[PDB]
């Protein structure tokens, strides 16, 4: 509702970034266990669904086989983790700027 929805868009984006960060950290910590499949969430589609709304995570394609059945690749996971952290901080900065502007309007 007005202020609520305008802030809610960025709040939901930030929450989705946090959940994706949690999934990435989980599948990085679990990177040395046989029989594990790397998981991730389609951020753009998930955010679009939530904006007009319990996340539907999906598997990640392997790039080179391993006998033990592990599909998590450390370099790709690290790059994705860094990208997600930067996106999270960017969203935090945008949200903080909007809130600070809204507060300063009342002064």
């Amino acid at each position: 509702d007005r202020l609520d929805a305008a802030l809610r868009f960025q709040q939901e984006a930030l929450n989705l970034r946090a959940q994706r960060q949690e999934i990435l950290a989980a599948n990085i910590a679990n990177a040395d266990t046989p029989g594990y499949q790397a998981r991730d969430i389609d951020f753009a589609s998930e955010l679009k669904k939530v904006m007009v709304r319990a996340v539907d995570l999906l598997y990640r394609v392997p790039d080179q086989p391993s006998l033990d059945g592990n599909t998590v690749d450390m370099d790709r996971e690290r790059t994705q983790f860094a990208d997600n952290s930067l996106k999270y901080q960017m969203g935090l900065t945008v949200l903080g700027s909007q809130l600070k502007g809204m507060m300063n309007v009342l002064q």
């Binding site: 991730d40 389609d42 999906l58 598997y59 990640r60 394609v61 392997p62 790039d63 086989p65 391993s66």
Partner: peptide, 21 residues
């Protein structure tokens, strides 16, 4: 599809037999 992309289906297990039956 292309490695590093996202697909819904999981990955079949990897088997490396010593000798073909």
């Amino acid at each position: 599809g292309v490695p590093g992309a996202l697909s819904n289906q999981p990955a079949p297990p990897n088997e490396a037999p010593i000798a073909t039956p």
